[PDB]
Amino acid sequence: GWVPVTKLGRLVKAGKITTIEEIFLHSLPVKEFQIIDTLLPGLQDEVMNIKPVQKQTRAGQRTRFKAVVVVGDSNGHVGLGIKTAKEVAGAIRAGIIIAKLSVIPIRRGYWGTNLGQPHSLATKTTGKCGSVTVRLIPAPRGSGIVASPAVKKLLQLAGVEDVYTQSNGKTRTLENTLKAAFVAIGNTYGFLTPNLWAEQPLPVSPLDIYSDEASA
Amino acid sequence: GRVRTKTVKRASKALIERYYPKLTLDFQTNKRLCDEIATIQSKRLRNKIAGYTTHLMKRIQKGPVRGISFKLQEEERERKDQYVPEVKAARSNGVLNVDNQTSDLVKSLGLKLPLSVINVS
Amino acid sequence: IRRAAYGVVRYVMESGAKGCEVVVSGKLRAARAKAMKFADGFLIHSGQPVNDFIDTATRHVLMRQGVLGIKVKIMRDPAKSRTGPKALPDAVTIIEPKEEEPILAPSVKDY
RNA sequence: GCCAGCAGCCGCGGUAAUUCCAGCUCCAAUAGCGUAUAUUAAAGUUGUUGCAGUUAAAAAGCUCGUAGUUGAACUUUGGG
RNA sequence: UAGGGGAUCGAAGAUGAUCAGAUACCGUCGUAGUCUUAACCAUAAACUAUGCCGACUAGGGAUCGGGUGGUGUUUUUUUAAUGACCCACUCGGCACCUUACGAGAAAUCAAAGUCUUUGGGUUCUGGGGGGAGUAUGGUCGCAAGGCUGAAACUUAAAGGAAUUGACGGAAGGGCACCACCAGGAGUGGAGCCUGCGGCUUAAUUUGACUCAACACGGGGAAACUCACCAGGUCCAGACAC
RNA sequence: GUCUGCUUAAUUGCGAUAACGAACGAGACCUUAACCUACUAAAUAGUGGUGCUAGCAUUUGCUGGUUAUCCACUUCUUAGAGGGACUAUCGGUUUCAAGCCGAUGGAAUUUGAGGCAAUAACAGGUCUGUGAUGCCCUUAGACGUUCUGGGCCGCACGCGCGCUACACUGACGGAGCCAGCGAGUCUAACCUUGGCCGAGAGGUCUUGGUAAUCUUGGAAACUCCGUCGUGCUGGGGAUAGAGCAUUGUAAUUAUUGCUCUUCAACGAGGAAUUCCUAGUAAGCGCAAGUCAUCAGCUUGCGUUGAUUACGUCCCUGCC
C-alpha cells in the first residue's frame, strides 16, 4: 500500500477529481502528498545542493546534511522544499515530498506576436528573500534561459524555454536565491491583465459536491 | 516514594474505560480478574496496576473525577442534564422589565409588548 | 566503508528483525581517530532483556594503515521466538470485552 | 633523520618520507619544453552593460545653494 | 581668550585605604571646570552604525495633531451651546505587532521588498590585512587641532553571521552524609606499628604524588627472592665459512 | 524525537507534544540470606521407642552410657526439586494520572546485598606478570647469570594507614563457660588429638583423617563469686637484663615464644578533618591470603549491638 486521509485524500484515490487545475481553482490545501503522485506522474526530481549545516554537544560538534529539492515536468508546474535531516539516503527523501506539497502553477504565454504555442511568461515578475531580488523578463522566442546554472535548472522544469533575468543579492546563497525566484513565477498568477477581466462566475466546491464517498 | 508510573496508570486508565462493570474496590478481587482481561509482563507489576485502578472506583462513587468517561458516567449527564420548568413567562411585577429608553427602533420595528420601564444619575 | 555499513542493516531488517544499530571504530582516511554510528528500529540498553532479546559482536579487523572494531546488535521480535519471554517487561496488552444484549423479562426450558 | 634540501599556495622532512637525493616504474607536452617578467582573459575583485556601502572596507554631522544632472501632461487622431 | 559667577561636584594635585607592587579601583577634601556674557574651535558610537526625492506592493490594532459625519456620551439649566468623552471615518505624523508572496551570508528587513526576468531621478563613499589617518607638502586655528592625504616596507589572512560536540570563578533546576544537618565512633596529641618524604651512604635498588601516590605492585623482602652494590666463575656464543 | 511540569534509585514512568514507533544502558536477568510441620532420602544429620545399661529416687520416676541391640522415623540438620511477594487489602493523599504515607495480614528501604555495567574517552597507570611486544642498547673485564657475605630494617627530623590505653561502666583472678566463614596429608610430612614428659614454652610417642567421616561440639567480649578502693595505682606495659625453648645451611642489624624483674609516656588528644541511615556505627574474637617461619595488614564471618535522621541545596562536587 497507498491508504488515505482527510476529505481531500480518500477523494483522489477513488478518482472523482482528475486534474491539478479543479484544485488551484477552488485553491485547496494539501497536509498528504500522494494527492499529486496519482494525478501528475510526468513529474521528475532534481537535487541542487547538499551542504552540511550546524547546531554545534558538550564534547563535540553535531551535524546534518539542508538538501534542497526542485520538482516538476515541463508544463507550468513547479515544486519546491527544504528538509534538514540526519545522514542524507530522511533527508533527501522526505525533501522530495516537502517539495511535491508545494507544487505551484505557472502563466507560460506570449512575448508579443501572439503566434502559436507558449514559450515565455505573460508579464514582468519580481520576487524577494532576505537579500536576493529576482528580476524575472519576457524574452522573444528561443532567446535563451539567461541566468545562473541554478535558476536555469528551476526554470527548465517549469518548460517556460526563454526569459531574461537579473540579481542584486548575496547569489552565494544557494537557497535564499531559488527561495525568492520561485516567489515570482508563483505570481504570474497574482496580476490583472485586461484578458482576465471578463468576470468568471464561481463553480462549486468539491468539499460538498462529492460529500458522501468523502467519510465512512 | 510512595510515585506511580505510566507504563502503570495509562494500563488502569485504558482498562477503567471498558470494565467499570464481572467492576471493584476486597482490591484483592480485581487482582485475579486483572489477568483474565490484561495480557501482563509480571507478579509485581500487576499488583501495582490494581493498587492504582482501586484509587478509581475509591473516588468515583465519592464523585466526578478526570478526563475519563465510561458510558455509565457520560447518559449520568440526556439524565442530570435538565432544568427549570415553566420557562420565562412578568402576573408578578405583569409587564416585563424595558431601561425606559427601551421606544424608537421597535416603534420603527412590531406586534405586542406586555414591557416594563424610568422617567428621569 | 559507509556504503556496506547499509548488507549491514537492510539485509537484516528484511529478515523480519526488530532492530539493528553498528559501531565502526578505528581510523578513517584520517590520522586522528574515529567512531561512526548507524540504525533502524527501536533498541534497548538495559535489564535481563538485552540478556534475552538483542545480542552482540567483536570482529577485529589488519588494515595496512591501522586496525579496526566492528559491533553489531540485532534485536529479536518478541513473537518470533518459544527462548523465555514473549513480549518487553513493559508491554501491557488488552481484550475489547463482549457485545451483550439486555434483559427481556424473565424466561427457561424443559429437558 | 625539523638536518640537507623541496614547496608559485596549502605544506612535506624530528627512523618504516605517496613531496627532499637517487634507482626502477609510470603521467604530460612533445622538435620542442620549461623559467622569470610585463600584460590580458579569468575580473560582475572597476562595474555603462554588471558590483558593494545595517554589522564584512564603505551614507558626509545636518541643512541651504552657483555650476553639474534630471525634469507631470497637452497642440491630426480616426476613418474613407 | 578676557570679564562676571564661584553652592554642588570634581581630571588634576594631596591624601588614608586595600595591595606582592597600586602611581587605579574604596573614602575625605580639593583648584581648574562645570554656570553666564562676549568671542574662538567643528569634532563624536553626530547611531536607525540604514543618503534624500518619488511611485507600487499585506494584514492588522493602539496613539499625538487636525478635519468630517452619527435625533452620537455626559455635563443639566429649561432644551441646548459648546467642552470633555464614545464611536464612525479620514489626511499627516511618532512608533508596534503578524506574516512572508519577496529579499538576504545570515541575525533579520514593510522596507535591507519591487535586482542575473539585471536600468524611475541624482550627491557622497570602499575595493585584501596592516604600515597609518602617520610622514609629508598645502591650508583653516591664538593654541589645542581639524580638513586634505602618501609611499617604502611588510603579510596569507584580518574579518561577518551562525553551529554543539565543549569553556566561564554568569543566572535557573535537580542528585549524593566521598555534601551539609541531625548526631555516634574516631583520625590529627602520645607510648608504639608500618609506608611515603628527605639527609645518609660500598649501596641505602624500583614503580608510583590533588579525589585517580601513600600496611598499595597481593612488597609479611635473615639466604634466595633481587632489580643496589663489594667481589669470585662458567657460558648454558645456535647456524654457515 | 531527548520536552514546561509532576514523578522516581534512575531519559524511572504519565502526561504537555510535527513529531510516530524502536535499539543499547537502567531495569529485567545471575548470586547469596531469609520461609515452606507439603513432597524426596539419609550408621559421613538426628528422633522416640528399645534393650545392654551407669547414678540419684525409690512413685511408676529422675539422671545418664551405647557408629547397630535393634528397629522405626525425617520436625529437625542438610539439600534437590519445587513453590512463594505483587507494595497486597481498605483508608486516605493527588491532574483523584504517574506516585506517596499509614495500618492489617505477613517469614519477608530495589525482599537485603552484591556481580554484569553502554556512549565517548584519558596521551592516567603499566615493556619491573609475560616465551604479548616495538625501536634503540647490551653480547663474555656483558646490563647474561651464580656462589657468598652485607644492602632495600641505616636517623635530629616532614607527611599519611594503624594498634593498645588515660580506669572501680576497670584491672587482676577463680567459676560459669558460648558461634559462624575455612583448611588438610601423596607420593610425603598437612592436621595433629589421645596418653605420658615439661612451671611454661614445649617435647614426644603413637594415633586418626585425602575429610558433614579425624583435629573439630568447649574463641573472645560475659554471667558468675570476689580481691583491689581513688593511692600515675591494683590504670598504663615503654624500654630493658638474662637465661629456657621452637623453628631455620645461616638467627648477629635477639624470626617467635616464654620464663622472672627493669615499671617509659599519657591523666581524653589544638589548626584540621574524615566516614556512616539498620543487625546499621563500633569492639570482642577467630579461619583463610602470605608462609619454613615473623601481622600491629588483606579478606571474610558471626556473637553482643544502640544513638541519630529517614530531610534538604547553606556548602562542595558534579550533572
PDB file of C-alpha atoms (C1' of nucleotides) in Angstrom, chain E residues 98-235:
ATOM      1  C1'   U E  98       1.910  39.491  12.412  1.00  0.00           C
ATOM      2  C1'   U E  99       3.186  37.272   8.074  1.00  0.00           C
ATOM      3  C1'   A E 100       6.321  36.157   4.271  1.00  0.00           C
ATOM      4  C1'   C E 101       4.224  36.300  -1.637  1.00  0.00           C
ATOM      5  C1'   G E 102       9.599  38.681  -1.747  1.00  0.00           C
ATOM      6  C1'   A E 103      14.997  39.768  -0.117  1.00  0.00           C
ATOM      7  C1'   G E 104      19.423  38.156   2.343  1.00  0.00           C
ATOM      8  C1'   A E 105      25.771  35.040   4.212  1.00  0.00           C
ATOM      9  C1'   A E 106      22.796  35.021   7.684  1.00  0.00           C
ATOM     10  C1'   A E 107      20.791  37.614  12.568  1.00  0.00           C
ATOM     11  C1'   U E 108      16.582  39.691  10.497  1.00  0.00           C
ATOM     12  C1'   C E 109      14.042  43.673   6.980  1.00  0.00           C
ATOM     13  C1'   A E 110       7.157  46.951   5.146  1.00  0.00           C
ATOM     14  C1'   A E 111      11.434  48.015   3.814  1.00  0.00           C
ATOM     15  C1'   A E 112      17.699  45.950   3.676  1.00  0.00           C
ATOM     16  C1'   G E 113      10.863  44.479  -0.921  1.00  0.00           C
ATOM     17  C1'   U E 114       9.797  45.635  -6.483  1.00  0.00           C
ATOM     18  C1'   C E 115      17.921  43.025  -8.728  1.00  0.00           C
ATOM     19  C1'   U E 116      21.103  37.959 -13.277  1.00  0.00           C
ATOM     20  C1'   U E 117      13.282  38.339 -15.512  1.00  0.00           C
ATOM     21  C1'   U E 118      19.811  42.514 -14.052  1.00  0.00           C
ATOM     22  C1'   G E 119      18.110  50.207 -15.745  1.00  0.00           C
ATOM     23  C1'   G E 120      12.320  55.550 -12.064  1.00  0.00           C
ATOM     24  C1'   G E 121      15.521  60.547 -10.511  1.00  0.00           C
ATOM     25  C1'   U E 122      20.685  62.143  -8.783  1.00  0.00           C
ATOM     26  C1'   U E 123      25.122  63.564  -4.288  1.00  0.00           C
ATOM     27  C1'   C E 124      28.892  61.492  -1.458  1.00  0.00           C
ATOM     28  C1'   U E 125      31.873  56.819  -0.382  1.00  0.00           C
ATOM     29  C1'   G E 126      35.187  51.273  -0.441  1.00  0.00           C
ATOM     30  C1'   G E 127      37.922  47.891  -3.167  1.00  0.00           C
ATOM     31  C1'   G E 128      42.841  42.302   0.813  1.00  0.00           C
ATOM     32  C1'   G E 129      45.159  42.887   6.341  1.00  0.00           C
ATOM     33  C1'   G E 130      48.468  46.203   8.367  1.00  0.00           C
ATOM     34  C1'   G E 131      52.359  50.472   7.775  1.00  0.00           C
ATOM     35  C1'   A E 132      48.588  54.894   9.287  1.00  0.00           C
ATOM     36  C1'   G E 133      44.731  58.936   9.157  1.00  0.00           C
ATOM     37  C1'   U E 134      51.157  58.654  10.396  1.00  0.00           C
ATOM     38  C1'   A E 135      55.314  61.404   7.058  1.00  0.00           C
ATOM     39  C1'   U E 136      54.981  64.992   4.104  1.00  0.00           C
ATOM     40  C1'   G E 137      53.655  69.375   1.454  1.00  0.00           C
ATOM     41  C1'   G E 138      49.053  72.894   1.012  1.00  0.00           C
ATOM     42  C1'   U E 139      45.755  75.069   4.324  1.00  0.00           C
ATOM     43  C1'   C E 140      41.798  76.831   8.445  1.00  0.00           C
ATOM     44  C1'   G E 141      43.009  77.966  14.384  1.00  0.00           C
ATOM     45  C1'   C E 142      45.796  82.037  19.289  1.00  0.00           C
ATOM     46  C1'   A E 143      46.674  77.452  20.824  1.00  0.00           C
ATOM     47  C1'   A E 144      44.629  72.564  21.483  1.00  0.00           C
ATOM     48  C1'   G E 145      43.778  70.674  16.475  1.00  0.00           C
ATOM     49  C1'   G E 146      40.987  69.920  12.421  1.00  0.00           C
ATOM     50  C1'   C E 147      40.157  69.020   6.662  1.00  0.00           C
ATOM     51  C1'   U E 148      43.414  67.322   2.833  1.00  0.00           C
ATOM     52  C1'   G E 149      46.318  62.668   2.500  1.00  0.00           C
ATOM     53  C1'   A E 150      51.278  59.385   0.631  1.00  0.00           C
ATOM     54  C1'   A E 151      54.971  55.688  -0.306  1.00  0.00           C
ATOM     55  C1'   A E 152      58.812  52.260   1.019  1.00  0.00           C
ATOM     56  C1'   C E 153      58.356  48.179   3.650  1.00  0.00           C
ATOM     57  C1'   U E 154      55.980  44.083   5.316  1.00  0.00           C
ATOM     58  C1'   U E 155      51.770  39.940   5.147  1.00  0.00           C
ATOM     59  C1'   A E 156      48.086  34.759   3.929  1.00  0.00           C
ATOM     60  C1'   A E 157      44.878  36.018   6.093  1.00  0.00           C
ATOM     61  C1'   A E 158      42.189  40.014   9.141  1.00  0.00           C
ATOM     62  C1'   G E 159      37.063  39.752   9.297  1.00  0.00           C
ATOM     63  C1'   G E 160      30.969  38.830   9.219  1.00  0.00           C
ATOM     64  C1'   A E 161      26.992  35.920  10.780  1.00  0.00           C
ATOM     65  C1'   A E 162      25.746  31.492  12.562  1.00  0.00           C
ATOM     66  C1'   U E 163      26.654  25.730  14.816  1.00  0.00           C
ATOM     67  C1'   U E 164      27.069  21.912  19.663  1.00  0.00           C
ATOM     68  C1'   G E 165      30.230  18.398  20.158  1.00  0.00           C
ATOM     69  C1'   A E 166      32.786  21.950  24.770  1.00  0.00           C
ATOM     70  C1'   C E 167      34.525  26.559  28.270  1.00  0.00           C
ATOM     71  C1'   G E 168      33.280  30.506  32.211  1.00  0.00           C
ATOM     72  C1'   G E 169      35.305  31.738  39.200  1.00  0.00           C
ATOM     73  C1'   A E 170      27.185  34.273  34.725  1.00  0.00           C
ATOM     74  C1'   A E 171      21.766  33.009  36.001  1.00  0.00           C
ATOM     75  C1'   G E 172      17.822  28.985  36.821  1.00  0.00           C
ATOM     76  C1'   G E 173      16.985  23.286  38.376  1.00  0.00           C
ATOM     77  C1'   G E 174      17.868  18.749  40.355  1.00  0.00           C
ATOM     78  C1'   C E 175      21.136  14.326  42.693  1.00  0.00           C
ATOM     79  C1'   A E 176      24.656  12.087  46.586  1.00  0.00           C
ATOM     80  C1'   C E 177      26.353  12.091  54.783  1.00  0.00           C
ATOM     81  C1'   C E 178      33.287  10.542  49.011  1.00  0.00           C
ATOM     82  C1'   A E 179      27.930  17.316  50.639  1.00  0.00           C
ATOM     83  C1'   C E 180      25.896  19.704  54.964  1.00  0.00           C
ATOM     84  C1'   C E 181      22.034  18.839  59.177  1.00  0.00           C
ATOM     85  C1'   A E 182      20.772  15.519  62.898  1.00  0.00           C
ATOM     86  C1'   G E 183      24.151  13.120  65.856  1.00  0.00           C
ATOM     87  C1'   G E 184      27.924   8.424  67.034  1.00  0.00           C
ATOM     88  C1'   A E 185      32.745   6.356  66.753  1.00  0.00           C
ATOM     89  C1'   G E 186      37.170   8.365  65.553  1.00  0.00           C
ATOM     90  C1'   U E 187      41.963  10.212  62.799  1.00  0.00           C
ATOM     91  C1'   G E 188      45.482  14.855  63.884  1.00  0.00           C
ATOM     92  C1'   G E 189      48.289  14.808  70.540  1.00  0.00           C
ATOM     93  C1'   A E 190      51.021  10.370  72.634  1.00  0.00           C
ATOM     94  C1'   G E 191      53.585   5.327  74.293  1.00  0.00           C
ATOM     95  C1'   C E 192      54.426   2.187  69.514  1.00  0.00           C
ATOM     96  C1'   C E 193      53.148  -0.293  64.378  1.00  0.00           C
ATOM     97  C1'   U E 194      54.391   0.425  59.487  1.00  0.00           C
ATOM     98  C1'   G E 195      54.519   3.179  54.150  1.00  0.00           C
ATOM     99  C1'   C E 196      55.871   7.651  51.651  1.00  0.00           C
ATOM    100  C1'   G E 197      59.411  12.336  52.332  1.00  0.00           C
ATOM    101  C1'   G E 198      64.157  13.688  52.863  1.00  0.00           C
ATOM    102  C1'   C E 199      69.664  13.520  54.772  1.00  0.00           C
ATOM    103  C1'   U E 200      72.789   9.248  54.852  1.00  0.00           C
ATOM    104  C1'   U E 201      75.604   6.154  52.307  1.00  0.00           C
ATOM    105  C1'   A E 202      80.111   0.343  49.336  1.00  0.00           C
ATOM    106  C1'   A E 203      74.613   0.575  48.172  1.00  0.00           C
ATOM    107  C1'   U E 204      70.556   2.850  51.125  1.00  0.00           C
ATOM    108  C1'   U E 205      67.613  -0.866  44.341  1.00  0.00           C
ATOM    109  C1'   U E 206      62.473   0.292  41.711  1.00  0.00           C
ATOM    110  C1'   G E 207      57.171   1.738  40.021  1.00  0.00           C
ATOM    111  C1'   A E 208      54.069   5.079  41.742  1.00  0.00           C
ATOM    112  C1'   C E 209      52.319  12.065  44.149  1.00  0.00           C
ATOM    113  C1'   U E 210      45.215  16.689  44.168  1.00  0.00           C
ATOM    114  C1'   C E 211      39.522  12.914  44.551  1.00  0.00           C
ATOM    115  C1'   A E 212      42.732   8.769  40.412  1.00  0.00           C
ATOM    116  C1'   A E 213      50.699   8.290  45.369  1.00  0.00           C
ATOM    117  C1'   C E 214      50.969   6.918  50.325  1.00  0.00           C
ATOM    118  C1'   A E 215      50.456  -1.795  55.547  1.00  0.00           C
ATOM    119  C1'   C E 216      49.475  -0.015  47.831  1.00  0.00           C
ATOM    120  C1'   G E 217      52.974  -3.678  42.858  1.00  0.00           C
ATOM    121  C1'   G E 218      48.545  -9.327  46.501  1.00  0.00           C
ATOM    122  C1'   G E 219      56.142  -5.533  48.758  1.00  0.00           C
ATOM    123  C1'   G E 220      54.874 -10.040  55.569  1.00  0.00           C
ATOM    124  C1'   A E 221      61.915  -8.668  51.461  1.00  0.00           C
ATOM    125  C1'   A E 222      67.928 -13.085  57.641  1.00  0.00           C
ATOM    126  C1'   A E 223      69.967 -16.506  52.043  1.00  0.00           C
ATOM    127  C1'   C E 224      67.024 -16.799  47.703  1.00  0.00           C
ATOM    128  C1'   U E 225      63.704 -13.574  46.268  1.00  0.00           C
ATOM    129  C1'   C E 226      66.799  -9.131  43.744  1.00  0.00           C
ATOM    130  C1'   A E 227      66.325  -5.019  40.393  1.00  0.00           C
ATOM    131  C1'   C E 228      71.676  -1.788  44.639  1.00  0.00           C
ATOM    132  C1'   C E 229      76.478  -2.989  45.063  1.00  0.00           C
ATOM    133  C1'   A E 230      81.641  -5.191  47.187  1.00  0.00           C
ATOM    134  C1'   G E 231      83.513  -9.170  44.693  1.00  0.00           C
ATOM    135  C1'   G E 232      84.625 -14.699  42.742  1.00  0.00           C
ATOM    136  C1'   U E 233      83.329 -18.315  37.867  1.00  0.00           C
ATOM    137  C1'   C E 234      81.308 -20.676  33.890  1.00  0.00           C
ATOM    138  C1'   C E 235      78.734 -19.878  29.029  1.00  0.00           C
TER     139        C E 235
END
